[PDB]
Design a protein around this nucleic acid. Structure first.
Ligand SMILES: [Mg+2]
Lengths: 36, 50, 50, 49, 269
DNA sequence: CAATTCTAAA
RNA sequence: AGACGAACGGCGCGUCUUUAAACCAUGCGUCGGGAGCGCGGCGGGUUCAGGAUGAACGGCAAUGCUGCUCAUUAGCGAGAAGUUUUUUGCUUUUAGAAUUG
C-alpha cells in the first residue's frame, strides 16, 4: 500500500489472533462426494 | 458429478469421447513434403500407405 | 529453587528427579516440556542482568 | 490458494505439501486435547507432546 | 508385584493420615471442617462429632506445654473417620491454597533479597533460616557490613512491610510462621511419598497394561488408541484398587479395558 | 555469459 | 402426469403419488436476479424467564409492498460453428556435445 520501510519482529499471540479470521478445527478437507 | 469420480478412482469407465492432437507444422516454416515414413510396432493392422 | 539448595539452571533427569521429589515435593518446582522453558523465560529479567 | 490441492481425479492431488503437514499437526493437537479432557496419566501425555 | 501395590496403598493411607494430623494441628482447617459439617447438617457419627467439638474446645483452651501430647492424642482419636473422596480432595485443595499463598509470601520476600543485592545462596540459607521474623535479617545483616550488607537499607523497608503483611497472614493462620512452615513441610513430605506411590504404580504397571492390551491387534483401530484407552480404564479401575482380592491383576482389568476399547472403536471408527 | 541446435536422466 | 429436496424460479436429478414427506447432512446438482434509498419482514443469533419450553430483541436478513432516481461485461494465444455461441492450451528441470559474439 505504498509503504516506505519494513519492520520485522516477533509475533505476539494477540497479533496472531489479530491477523486471522477464525480457529481451524478438523483435519478433513472436502466433502469427497462433492468437492465443496 | 458425485458418485462418478469416486467410481472413476474405483474402477474407471470413460465415455467414448474424442479429442484431437494432430501434428501441425510449427509456424513460420514453409515446406514441400518430400517424404513420409511410417513405422508400425509388430503385431498391428497396417495402413494403406505402409 | 527457593530456600532448598536448588539452582535455577541445574538440570536433573528422571532418577535424580525421583530422589529430589522424595527429598522435597514443594520448593522443587517440577515442570517439563516446552511450558517449562516458556515459564523460565518469563522469570528472567533483562535490564538488571544487562 | 498458496497451498492449492488440485482435484485432478479424486483423492489424489497436484498440491503443495503443506496440506499433509497441517493435517498431521491438527490431528496430534486434537489428540492432546482429548487426553487433557480424559485426565490420562503422565507418560501418555509425555508421548503426546 | 503385589508388594508394590500393597506398599502404595498402606503408604497412601499413611500420607492421608499425616495431612489429616496436620489439619488437626492447624486451626482454620478445623474451622472449615466444622463449618462444612454444620452446613451439611448416624448416632455414632453424632457422638464422634461431639467428641471432636469437645476436643477442639479443650485443646484451644490449653494452648499453653501439654498441648503436644494433647495433639498427639487428638491425632489418634481423629483417624477413626473414613475420608470421602470429594471432601478429602476439597479440604486438601483449600489447605494447599493456603500453602500456595504462603509460598507466594516466601517468593516475594526472597526476591527482595536474592537478585536486588545478588545475595549468596549459602550465606542466606545459613543465616536467614531459623528465625524468619526477627531483626536477625533486618538490621543484623547490616551489622557485619559485609559486601552484601551495605545496600540493604535501600530495600530493608520493602522487606519490612512485606513481612508485616506476612505476619498479618500469620495471625490469619494462628500458629507462628515457623510452625506453619514445619507443618506444611510435613504435609508436603507425605504428599511427596504419595506422588512417588502413584509414580511407582504407573511405572511398574505399564508392562501389565500393555501386555493385557496387546491381546487385540486387528481391530482396525490404531494401536495408540488401544494403549491410551486401555491405560485410562485401568487407571480409573486402580483408583479404588483392592489388594485383599486373591485374583491376579489382569482379572481386575479385562472388562474395563474391553468396554473402553468398544467405546473407542464405536465412536472414532 | 546472452541465445541456437541436438542428445541423455528424472 | 403432478408433488417435496436451506428462500423464489428455470433446468438437472433422488424419492412419493394428491400427501408432504422421505433421503442426505456447512440439510443434493446448476443459472438467474438493470438500479440505489424506503416499508414491513422468511431465515438465523442474542437476552430474559420457564424447567425442556414461553416471551422480547434488532447487527443482519428471504418471498413480497407504496414510493424517490444513477444508467448498461469480457485473461492470453490457436481452432471451429453461426451480431451469437463453441473446443483447446505442456515435464519442466538436470546434465552433456557443437557454434555464435
Ligand atoms: Mg563479432
Amino acid at each position: 500500500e505504498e509503504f516506505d520501510a519494513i519492520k520485522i519482529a516477533l509475533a505476539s499471540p494477540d497479533m496472531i489472533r489479530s491477523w486471522s479470521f477464525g480457529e481451524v478445527k478438523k483435519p478433513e478437507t472436502i466433502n469427497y462426494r462433492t468437492f465443496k | 458429478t458425485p458418485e462418478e469420480k469416486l467410481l472413476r478412482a474405483i474402477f474407471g469407465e470413460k465415455a467414448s469421447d474424442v479429442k484431437d492432437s494432430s501434428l501441425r507444422v510449427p509456424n513460420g516454416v514453409s515446406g514441400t513434403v518430400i517424404d513420409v515414413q511410417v513405422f508400425t510396432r509388430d503385431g498391428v493392422e497396417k495402413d494403406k500407405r505402409a | 529453587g527457593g530456600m532448598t539448595n536448588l539452582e535455577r539452571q541445574q538440570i536433573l533427569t528422571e532418577e535424580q528427579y525421583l530422589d529430589a521429589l522424595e527429598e522435597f515435593g514443594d520448593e522443587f518446582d517440577a515442570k517439563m516440556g516446552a511450558e517449562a522453558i516458556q515459564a523460565l523465560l518469563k522469570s528472567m529479567d533483562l535490564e538488571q542482568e544487562c | 490458494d498458496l497451498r492449492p490441492l488440485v482435484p485432478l481425479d479424486g483423492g489424489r492431488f497436484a498440491t503443495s505439501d503443506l496440506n499433509d503437514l497441517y493435517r498431521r499437526v491438527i490431528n496430534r493437537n486434537n489428540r492432546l486435547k482429548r487426553l487433557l479432557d480424559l485426565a490420562a496419566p503422565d507418560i501418555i501425555v509425555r508421548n503426546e507432546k | 508385584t503385589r508388594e508394590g501395590e500393597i506398599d502404595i496403598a498402606k503408604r497412601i493411607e499413611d500420607g492421608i493420615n499425616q495431612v489429616q494430623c496436620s489439619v488437626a494441628e492447624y486451626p482454620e482447617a478445623i474451622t472449615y471442617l466444622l463449618e462444612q459439617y454444620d452446613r451439611v447438617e448416624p448416632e455414632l457419627a453424632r457422638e464422634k462429632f461431639a467428641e471432636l467439638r469437645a476436643q477442639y474446645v479443650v485443646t484451644r483452651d490449653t494452648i499453653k506445654a501439654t498441648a503436644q501430647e494433647e495433639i498427639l492424642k487428638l491425632s489418634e482419636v481423629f483417624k477413626q473417620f473414613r475420608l470421602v473422596p470429594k471432601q478429602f480432595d476439597y479440604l486438601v485443595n483449600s489447605m494447599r491454597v493456603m500453602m500456595d499463598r504462603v509460598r507466594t509470601q516466601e517468593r516475594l520476600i526472597m526476591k527482595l533479597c536474592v537478585e536486588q543485592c545478588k545475595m549468596p545462596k549459602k550465606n542466606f540459607i545459613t543465616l536467614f533460616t531459623g528465625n524468619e521474623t526477627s531483626d536477625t535479617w533486618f538490621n543484623a545483616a547490616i551489622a557485619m557490613n559485609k559486601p552484601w550488607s551495605e545496600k540493604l537499607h535501600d530495600v530493608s523497608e520493602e522487606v519490612h512491610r512485606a513481612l508485616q503483611k506476612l505476619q498479618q497472614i500469620e495471625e490469619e493462620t494462628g500458629l507462628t510462621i515457623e510452625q506453619v512452615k514445619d507443618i506444611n513441610r510435613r504435609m508436603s513430605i507425605g504428599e511427596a511419598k504419595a506422588r512417588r506411590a502413584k509414580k511407582e504404580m504407573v511405572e511398574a504397571n505399564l508392562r501389565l497394561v500393555i501386555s493385557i492390551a496387546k491381546k487385540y491387534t486387528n481391530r482396525g483401530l490404531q494401536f495408540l488408541d488401544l494403549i491410551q484407552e486401555g491405560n485410562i480404564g485401568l487407571m480409573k479401575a486402580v483408583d479404588k484398587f483392592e489388594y485383599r482380592r486373591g485374583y491376579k491383576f489382569s482379572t481386575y482389568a479385562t472388562w474395563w479395558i474391553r468396554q473402553a476399547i468398544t467405546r473407542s472403536i464405536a465412536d472414532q471408527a
